[PDB]
Amino acid sequence: ATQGVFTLPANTRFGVTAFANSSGTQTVNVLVNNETAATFSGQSTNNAVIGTQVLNSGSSGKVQVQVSVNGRPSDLVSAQVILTNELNFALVGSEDGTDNDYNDAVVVINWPLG
Amino acid sequence: ATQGVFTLPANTRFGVTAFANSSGTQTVNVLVNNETAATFSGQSTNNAVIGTQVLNSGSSGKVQVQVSVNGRPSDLVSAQVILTNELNFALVGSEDGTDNDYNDAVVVINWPLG
Amino acid sequence: ATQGVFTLPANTRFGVTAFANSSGTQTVNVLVNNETAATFSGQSTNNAVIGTQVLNSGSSGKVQVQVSVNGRPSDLVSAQVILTNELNFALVGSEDGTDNDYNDAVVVINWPLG
Amino acid sequence: ATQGVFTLPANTRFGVTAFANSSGTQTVNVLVNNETAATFSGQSTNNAVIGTQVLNSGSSGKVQVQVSVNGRPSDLVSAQVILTNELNFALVGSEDGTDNDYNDAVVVINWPLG
Numbered sequence: 001a002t003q004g005v006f007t008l009p010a011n012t013r014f015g016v017t018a019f020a021n022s023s024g025t026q027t028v029n030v031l032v033n034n035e036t037a038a039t040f041s042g043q044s045t046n047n048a049v050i051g052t053q054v055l056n057s058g059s060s061g062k063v064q065v066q067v068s069v070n071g072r073p074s075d076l077v078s079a080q081v082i083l084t085n086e087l088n089f090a091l092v093g094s095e096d097g098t099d100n101d102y103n104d105a106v107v108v109i110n111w112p113l114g
Numbered sequence: 115a116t117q118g119v120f121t122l123p124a125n126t127r128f129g130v131t132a133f134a135n136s137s138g139t140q141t142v143n144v145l146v147n148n149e150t151a152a153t154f155s156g157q158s159t160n161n162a163v164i165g166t167q168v169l170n171s172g173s174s175g176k177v178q179v180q181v182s183v184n185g186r187p188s189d190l191v192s193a194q195v196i197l198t199n200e201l202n203f204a205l206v207g208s209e210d211g212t213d214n215d216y217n218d219a220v221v222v223i224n225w226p227l228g
Numbered sequence: 229a230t231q232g233v234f235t236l237p238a239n240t241r242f243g244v245t246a247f248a249n250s251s252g253t254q255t256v257n258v259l260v261n262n263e264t265a266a267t268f269s270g271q272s273t274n275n276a277v278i279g280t281q282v283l284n285s286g287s288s289g290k291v292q293v294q295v296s297v298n299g300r301p302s303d304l305v306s307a308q309v310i311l312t313n314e315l316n317f318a319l320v321g322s323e324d325g326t327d328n329d330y331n332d333a334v335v336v337i338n339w340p341l342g
Numbered sequence: 343a344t345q346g347v348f349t350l351p352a353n354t355r356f357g358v359t360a361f362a363n364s365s366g367t368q369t370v371n372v373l374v375n376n377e378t379a380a381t382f383s384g385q386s387t388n389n390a391v392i393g394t395q396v397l398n399s400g401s402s403g404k405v406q407v408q409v410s411v412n413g414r415p416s417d418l419v420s421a422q423v424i425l426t427n428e429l430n431f432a433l434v435g436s437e438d439g440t441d442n443d444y445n446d447a448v449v450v451i452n453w454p455l456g
């Protein structure tokens with residue numbers, strides 16, 4: 001199944017943060033309405049924040065996270081969870097190798113902000 | 115119900131990161147097996163990272179997040195989500211006022227690391 | 229009588245540790261030379277350590293502990309005890325309510341260290 | 343004279359917390375009714391908390407603290423202090439070598455909890 005795609009409310013600001021747990025350098029692309037809005041690169045085996053920014057969901061509200069390492073797409077896992085019917089997390093894990101810890105790049109989207 | 119308390123696998127490194135979205139200065143305390151292990155503080159109304167750090171879950175794996183603003187505890191919502199039986203997120207939202215957006219301090223715990 | 233004030237030997241490392249046994253969120257201020265040197269906050273009814281720190285007694289050796297819950301100073305009990313003319317504990321109890329168990333925040337200062 | 347043994351009220355929750363101040367790894371065993379109830383181990387020269395736990399008095403209320411380093415028992419000092427006839431500290435210092443600072447393992451027992 002498709003992973004890493006989330007439909008946010010239209011024209012809503014959200015935060016996106018990325019963490020790295022791999023010897024390989026993680027590049028994370030966040031696409032808004034099928035166009036790229038932010039790009040994080042970094043290497044870390046200790047969960048360092050390689051990127052975090054605020055973006056707007058736009059007309060569409062379509063948000064997609066992709067994870068490449070050295071030009072190889074990583075296998076993604078994802079889900080959205082909503083607490084008290086109002087606080088939202090869109091969650092992405094990814095695997096770049098064979099150990100299946102799916103933490104090599106971890107991406108957290110949260111809204112609303114402010 | 116108790117919120118913000120999570121049982122992790124024993125002696126496991128985990129990441130904890132807090133973002134803020136409130137006029138009020140947020141204070142996040144992270145206790146591991148009933149000893150405070152990390153303390154974040156900051157103020158932001160557009161999701162700034164006010165703290166991030168790697169901790170070990172220790173013998174019993176008990177992690178608790180608490181959020182206060184000027185000595186008053188905020189009301190917490192929480193849940194844990196597990197993807198592909200391997201990647202864990204423990205999620206905390208908090209409300210320090212009356213608007214109930216529960217994003218005033220947002221805390222994300224993730225594991226495994228490395 | 230004043231409680232929670234102790235005169236340490238000047239320029240001496242000491243440990244300070246706070247426990248909580250209250251439904252109320254405890255805020256422990258530790259002042260050295262009448263300036264706040266450390267602040268702990270936390271909530272527990274099972275004696276969690278809500279803060280621990282190593283500090284220096286400074287020029288004056290004067291250390292003071294203050295406890296409030298939601299801005300209300302608690303009533304303090306204190307004493308100092310010295311074992312084999314060497315081992316020092318400065319002890320603080322505090323009550324934030326009416327049951328007078330004086331365990332709501334418990335603060336223990338010990339020296340020498342090392 | 344015997345040190346590190348205290349008669350608590352029967353069937354009473356109490357906290358026990360240990361600090362290390364030595365190059366040697368300290369092992370702290372807490373016996374309730376002559377039976378091992380908790381074991382802490384660790385090494386620090388900066389008063390790090392090597393263990394905290396809540397235990398029960400039991401029928402006897404007999405609590406005893408023992409400290410060993412590399413197998414060899416440390417010499418203990420102890421006293422109990424009661425403030426406002428209600429808040430109890432049972433206090434232990436230990437010496438594992440020659441300098442007689444008696445802080446090599448420091449254990450604080452306090453009650454009541456809650």
Ligand SMILES: *C(=O)C[C@@H]1O[C@@H](C)[C@@H](O)[C@@H](O)[C@@H]1O
Pocket residue numbers: 249250251252273323324325326327328329332456
């Ligand atoms: C409640 O506000 C008062 C408070 O919490 C109780 C659980 C108990 O610990 C009591 O001693 C404390 O004052």
Ligand SMILES: [Ca+2]
Pocket residue numbers: 022094095096097098099100101102103104
């Ligand atoms: Ca991997």
Ligand SMILES: [Ca+2]
Pocket residue numbers: 021022101102103104227228
């Ligand atoms: Ca990894």
Ligand SMILES: [Ca+2]
Pocket residue numbers: 136209210211212213214215216217218
């Ligand atoms: Ca709010």
Ligand SMILES: [Ca+2]
Pocket residue numbers: 113114135136215216217218
């Ligand atoms: Ca808010």
Ligand SMILES: [Ca+2]
Pocket residue numbers: 250323324325326327328329330331332
């Ligand atoms: Ca009380």
Ligand SMILES: [Ca+2]
Pocket residue numbers: 249250329330331332455456
């Ligand atoms: Ca109490």
Ligand SMILES: [Ca+2]
Pocket residue numbers: 364437438439440441442443444445446
């Ligand atoms: Ca010694």
Ligand SMILES: [Ca+2]
Pocket residue numbers: 341342363364443444445446
């Ligand atoms: Ca020592």
